[PDB]
């Protein structure tokens, strides 16, 4: 499949934000011709199942089909749409009533804002009328792993894509011990996924990270400590306060040495230590990068320049209510991609509907979050005993979708000038609209125990 020479809507990157933008454009303009250029070989797909439900299938073909069961058992594909949804890129200009094409395996390597043109890595030039940059980010490694040999680098997975799921799943069945580096939500999800597999196969899983507890940069100490206990109980050797000094190879094994002197021998490493936004195009493009948050600096409408917008993990945007931010969440990619698509068809709307975050550690434990969430902010948490329905599985049986979008549950309010600017919900489902309204209203609350009643948390 070849690139057309001109396309009205050009979306750079073939992930969640681009897909959402394409759908939005087509809804606003039903004959739109939209080209997605994707360096990846895969059609657009959702990432969350890669660290969650794909690991909990009881089906040995899941690695081939990439159809997973949600916690409720409803089956679905990781792809947003099947191939039949798309048209060919070369035919895009001629198909009556347009369509969405994906040019896969192709990287945009130059942006020329003056001439409304991009150059691909094979040398093709495409002119556009409107352009969305939705390039997401690249997983970070550790300098310690960078300074190790090629052999250490070959046995380290920087977990992000379908191909990483497939390699790691195969590895999980071949080796004795896997070490996850990273204590955030992704690391902890992977630790639970691998912990589960290790129980059936009789293997080992280690999770190490610098913080005192799992998700300690986000959650208050009491819930981060509870979370660490939960991951341990999945049969994970959790090693907090761990800074990697060096990694080497010895007798076939990876040898990880910590600053504090502890040593881990393992067979493979998985890194989940965060993301670097993909801003290479800012150079040729003359586009501003945000030096505080990283990513492309765009306004409240996600606009960089007259006919260029940015969405998803790559966009540092102005939130009129909460201030300048950059967000790396699935629902944010959907919401921002959809908004950018509306704006590319003339809507001129600011980012207003707050996106949410969610994480599940198996079908029994879930977290949701919205707004400005950081364990350095002042927090007030209100907790209660969990009922039978306060878990991701029993929630998934209602919707029924796994893609969200004695204490066992609770709410945590994150405060700035004693207004709620962020909320985390622990095992409380189907209440994100209430959390969204609380943050939107921006009231000073006499009693956060009263607000907690809105989440069905009582005393
Ligand atoms: C394993 C995993 C699990 C996750 N789980 C959750 C979760 O449970 N909840 C949640 O809220 N969020 C989750 N996320 C985050 C969520 O998936 C991301 O926020 C979302 O994928 C961001 O979408 P995006 O389109 O901005 O970027 P991406 O999905 O990164 O897509 C960008 C695409 O553009 C391509 N590209 C980059 N540069 C170029 C170029 N120059 N030319 C052409 N193509 C290019 C990239 O290769 C990539 O394929 C998870 C992420 C991962 C990796």
From Swiss-Prot:
Changing residue 110 to H: In SEMDHL; severe decrease of protein expression. GO terms for biological process: apoptotic process; cellular response to aldosterone; cellular response to estradiol stimulus; cellular response to hydrogen peroxide; cellular response to hypoxia; cellular response to nitric oxide; intrinsic apoptotic signaling pathway in response to endoplasmic reticulum stress; mitochondrial disulfide relay system. This is Apoptosis-inducing factor 1, mitochondrial. The modification N6-acetyllysine is found at residues 263, 440. The chain holds residues 126 to 612 of 613 of the full protein. The modification Phosphoserine is found at residues 143, 167, 246, 399, 405. Its main location: mitochondrion. The gene is AIFM1. It is found in: Mitochondrion intermembrane space; Mitochondrion inner membrane; Cytoplasm; Nucleus.
């Amino acid at each position: 499949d070849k690139a057309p020479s001109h396309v009205p809507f050009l979306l750079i990157g073939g992930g969640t934000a681009a897909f959402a933008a394409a759908r939005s454009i087509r809804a606003r303009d039903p004959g739109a011709r939209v080209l997605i250029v994707s360096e990846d070989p895969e059609l657009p797909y959702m990432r969350p199942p890669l660290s969650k439900e794909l690991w909990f299938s009881d089906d040995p073909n899941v690695t081939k089909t990439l159809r997973f069961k949600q916690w409720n058992g409803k089956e679905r594909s990781i792809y947003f749409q099947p191939p039949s949804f798309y048209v060919s890129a070369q035919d895009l200009p001629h198909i009556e009533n347009g369509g969405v094409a994906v040019l896969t395996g192709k990287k945009v390597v130059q942006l020329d804002v003056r001439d409304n043109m991009v150059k691909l890595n094979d040398g093709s030039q495409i002119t556009y009328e409107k352009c969305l940059i939705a390039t997401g980010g690249t997983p970070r490694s550790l300098s310690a792993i960078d300074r190790a040999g090629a052999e250490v680098k070959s046995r380290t997975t920087l977990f992000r894509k379908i191909g990483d799921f497939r390699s790691l799943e195969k590895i999980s069945r071949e080796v004795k011990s896997i070490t996850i580096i990273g204590g955030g939500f992704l690391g902890s999800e992977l630790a639970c996924a691998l912990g589960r597999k290790a129980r059936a196969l009789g293997t080992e899983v280690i999770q190490l990270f610098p913080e005192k507890e799992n998700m300690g940069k986000i959650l208050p100490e009491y819930l981060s400590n509870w979370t660490m206990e939960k991951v341990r109980r999945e049969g994970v050797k959790v090693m907090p306060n761990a800074i990697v000094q060096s990694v080497g190879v010895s007798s076939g094994k990876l040898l990880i040495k910590l600053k504090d002197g502890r040593k881990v021998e393992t067979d493979h490493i998985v890194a989940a230590v965060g993301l670097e936004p993909n801003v290479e195009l800012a150079k040729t493009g003359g586009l501003e990068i945000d030096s505080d948050f990283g990513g492309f600096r765009v306004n409240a409408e996600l606009q960089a320049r007259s006919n260029i917008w940015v969405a998803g993990d790559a966009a540092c945007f102005y939130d009129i209510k909460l201030g300048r931010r950059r967000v790396e969440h699935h629902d944010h990619a959907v919401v921002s991609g959809r908004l950018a698509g509306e704006n590319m068809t003339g809507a001129a709307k600011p980012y207003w509907h707050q996106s949410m975050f969610w994480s599940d550690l198996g079908p029994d434990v879930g977290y949701e979050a919205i707004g400005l969430v950081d364990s350095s902010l002042p927090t007030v948490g209100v907790f209660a005993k969990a009922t039978a329905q306060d878990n991701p599985k029993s929630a998934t049986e209602q919707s029924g979708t796994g893609i969200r979008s004695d204490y066992g549950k609770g709410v945590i309010f994150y405060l700035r000038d004693k207004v709620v600017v962020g909320i985390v919900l622990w095992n409380i489902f189907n209440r994100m609209p209430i959390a969204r309204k609380i943050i939107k209203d921006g009231e000073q609350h006499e009693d956060l125990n009263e607000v907690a009643k809105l989440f069905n948390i009582h005393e």
